[PDB]
Amino acid sequence: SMQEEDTFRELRIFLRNVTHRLAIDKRFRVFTKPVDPDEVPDYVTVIKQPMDLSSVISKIDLHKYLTVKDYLRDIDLICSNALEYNPDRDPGDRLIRHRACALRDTAYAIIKEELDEDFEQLCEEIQESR
């Protein structure tokens, strides 16, 4: 209907605002762009599911997120990818891992404080019923 359209627009607006708040945080500057294949020519071979905040924005705007659950799966990728590609004890790796998973914990904490559970449930029930 347009009730349903109104629901998904509100979701998109909410997901944009969360994604913007992550993207202007200095800690996360490295996650605002896909990994450059110049700097890292083995990344896009090793990391099957590249994910970054600019990609998340594109998916919001292409209506690929019908639930916060779907959105958080992509946020989880930004962290799990960082852990997978940068596992070493050296500070370079430890810093990207720390940041990647602080991005994850920030997104979860924002959504925990600001997402109405009943709004997520409505989104889930519309999605399941399609």
Residue 7's identity, in one-letter code, is T
Q: Cβ(107)–Cβ(22) under 8 Å?
A: yes
49 close to 30: Cβ distance less than 8 angstroms:
no
- Contacts of ligand HH8 in 67-126 (CB under 6 A): 82, 85-86, 96
- Binding-residue total with ligand HH8 (CB under 6 A): 8
- Residues from 13 through 72 that contact ligand HH8 (CB under 6 A): 30, 35, 39-40
**Nearest partner of 109 among 60, 58, 75, judged by Cα:** 75
State the nearest-atom distance from the C-beta of 22 to ligand HH8, in Å: 14
Closest to ligand HH8 by CB, 72 or 126: 72
